[PDB]
Design a protein around this ligand. Sequence first.
Ligand SMILES: Nc1ncnc2c1ncn2[C@@H]1O[C@H](COP(=O)(O)OP(=O)(O)O)[C@@H](O)[C@H]1O
Ligand SMILES: [Mg+2]
Lengths: 49, 42, 469
Amino acid sequence: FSRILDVQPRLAILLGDCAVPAEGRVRLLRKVLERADSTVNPVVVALLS
Amino acid sequence: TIPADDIQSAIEEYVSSFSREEVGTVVDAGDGIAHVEGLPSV
Amino acid sequence: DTSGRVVRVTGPVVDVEFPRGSIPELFNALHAEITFESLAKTLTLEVAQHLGDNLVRTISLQPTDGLVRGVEVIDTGRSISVPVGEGVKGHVFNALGDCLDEPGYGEKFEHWSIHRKPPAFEELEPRTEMLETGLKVVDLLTPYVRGGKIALFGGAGVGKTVLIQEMINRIARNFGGTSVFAGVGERTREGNDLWVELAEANVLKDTALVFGQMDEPPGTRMRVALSALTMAEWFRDEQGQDVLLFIDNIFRFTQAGSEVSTLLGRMPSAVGYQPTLADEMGELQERITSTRGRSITSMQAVYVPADDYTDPAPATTFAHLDATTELSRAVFSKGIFPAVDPLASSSTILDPSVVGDEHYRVAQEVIRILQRYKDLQDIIAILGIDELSEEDKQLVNRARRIERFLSQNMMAAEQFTGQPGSTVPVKETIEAFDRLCKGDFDHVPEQAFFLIGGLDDLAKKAESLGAKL
Ligand SMILES: Nc1ncnc2c1ncn2[C@@H]1O[C@H](COP(=O)(O)OP(=O)(O)O)[C@@H](O)[C@H]1O
Ligand SMILES: [Mg+2]
């Protein structure tokens, strides 16, 4: 997921606007993550959340 | 094995689901000088 | 995308943030937009520093009034480029290469970066050929070098612009090459005056004018000299024919560099100048040069702040020149024009082997007489001239007549006196001042030496005052 994220910086920077209320970012994050859940673990979801 | 999905409107939904008017809250003042937080479009 | 975002706008310095891996190189030109309807424009920002965490500190070349945080910044991927070629002759340009008297002209020319390296040490060769102007004091005491570097050092409003227009009239009017004029941070009235003057003297078809004036932000005044210098470097390296390069107030380059220095986050040096004063000046001045076989006769006006020749900016510019004509306000106050200080002005070709031994001997005797007069002046002021020797009274008379005979009626001063100017060959100057130092004119009054040409005009004005010669 590191590889997944950093070479896609346009959405990586998106998860960076701290001025946005915080949930907003993970709000999008879950949107992409369980976009399909072959991120087969939930602990990973909790950590990066 | 990778989520090579790249559903981009997944991103569209988030950012474009975001009028009133920008209002700055004076943060500190004194001696004729005032700092103003907010107002992202001055 | 991979475009940036404005983060801070503090005057002419703007910080931008780029995505990781898309940081622009140093000295790139970025475009931003000002959309406010009355001040709408396109800002060009030059990348000055890499701050870290993808931030980039840049200097705007236009006023930032109306810029908003978070607007998009486009990276052009290259430095500031200016047009080059035989097509820039006869036109006026910005510091950014935009033609002023014909907007849109030069968009299709070859474009050259305004950031280049100086020529390598193996292509440099000393120039020791005299460039004869026609002014008495210049041809005698500071003979100009042809293909070398010349300056007019001066305080605020002594003679610099008038003398540089005089040298445009003398050297460039009958010149067999290409001239480039860089007005670096000077008055716009003077720029328009020079434009019209070159247009009526038919010198404009051989000149490329580049103007960044005092109303411009410090970025324009930092880069206009580099723009005009890039045009001159093209004329020298590719076309290869006898470039002339005038620069009105190269000091404005250093001053603009010092106006943004602390905003860029640099501790100030001695007199409030940027810590990088000498090195920026050397990076710019070492490009203003002639290589082996390729000539650039450079001439720069150098403002001396508050008539202080110990100020770090002129003190650093001194080391870059072959001939320095130093104007003084003590000579300006006496009505002597050009207000050249003969005891401080210098030249490297004032050498017995270059200008000949008669020229050198006459110049040395003039300088010795004037130095002795300066040594006596205070005694004369307090105790009176009658307390001196007869040796010294003779020397004082000769020295006053010499100080007055160095002045001249210049062609570019007909607006301040109404009297047309004159040209004096160098041999006539040498003969005249030889006679002056020997004492052949000790009977002619002090005047009739004041604002005249050669010896025949001296005779005419002496008879107009009742004297022989
Ligand atoms: N040779 C001269 N004869 C008469 N007046 C002169 C001469 N040189 C300079 N001046 C006067 O000095 C003033 C300022 O000269 P200028 O060279 O423009 O100053 P600066 O060196 O600050 O550019 C001019 O307005 C002019 O009136
Ligand atoms: Mg001037």
